Amino acid sequence: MGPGFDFAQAIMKKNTVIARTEKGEFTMLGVYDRVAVIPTHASVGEIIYINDVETRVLDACALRDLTDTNLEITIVKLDRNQKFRDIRHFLPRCEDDYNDAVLSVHTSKFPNMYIPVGQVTNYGFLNLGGTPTHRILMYNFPTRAGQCGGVVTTTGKVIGIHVGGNGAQGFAAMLLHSYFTD
């Protein structure tokens, strides 16, 4: 509807796949080459479904900060026959607050879904499902089951992936450029 939705759509149409694990269907952001991200609670194993195709997982790493605190991001390398458009230049270098973000989701249940979530706070610490978690972004939108893995963008930046909510607020794990240096 506006330039925020334009940037979000451009990311969704080229840099997402539908990922299915034993724990459900997730929006999955492809970052570069065969490297993608998903919330760590997806519990990626040795085999994942990507757009309903059985795919070997070549590597999966659940990220933690240097305090050994959960970040809720898993970086997955997929045995896929095709590379993602490289979007690393759209990743922030530092922890930050944002104005006017969009949360975008694409699954079997919620195709072509875009949500203007408004102001994004650098919230920091969250007890997420009982797990101490750092680098959390917060938005005042009542997000629901089925939006985990959704991409959070502003114009020109891909800033996080949705990992939870409390009924009134939604929470995303930060994406930082330093997670994807090769």
Curated annotation (Swiss-Prot):
Active-site residues (renumbered): 41, 72, 148
Highest taxon listed in the record's lineage: Viruses
Residue ranges of domain Peptidase C3 in the record: 2-180
Catalytic activity: Selective cleavage of Gln-|-Gly bond in the poliovirus polyprotein. In other picornavirus reactions Glu may be substituted for Gln, and Ser or Thr for Gly
Localization, UniProt: Host cytoplasm
Function as written in the Swiss-Prot or TrEMBL entry: Major viral protease that mediates proteolytic processing of the polyprotein. Cleaves host EIF5B, contributing to host translation shutoff. Also cleaves host PABPC1, contributing to host translation shutoff. Binds and inhibits host IFIH1/MDA5, thereby inhibiting the type-I IFN production and the establishment of the antiviral state. Cleaves host MAP3K7/TAK1, resulting in inhibition of TRAF6-triggered NF-kappa-B induction. Cleaves host TICAM1; this interaction allows the virus to disrupt host TLR3 signaling. Cleaves host IRF7, resulting in inhibition of type-I IFN production.
Oligomer status and interactors: Interacts with host IFIH1/MDA5; this interaction inhibits host IFIH1.
Protein name stated in the entry: Protease 3C
Portion of the parent chain present: 1549 to 1729 of 2188
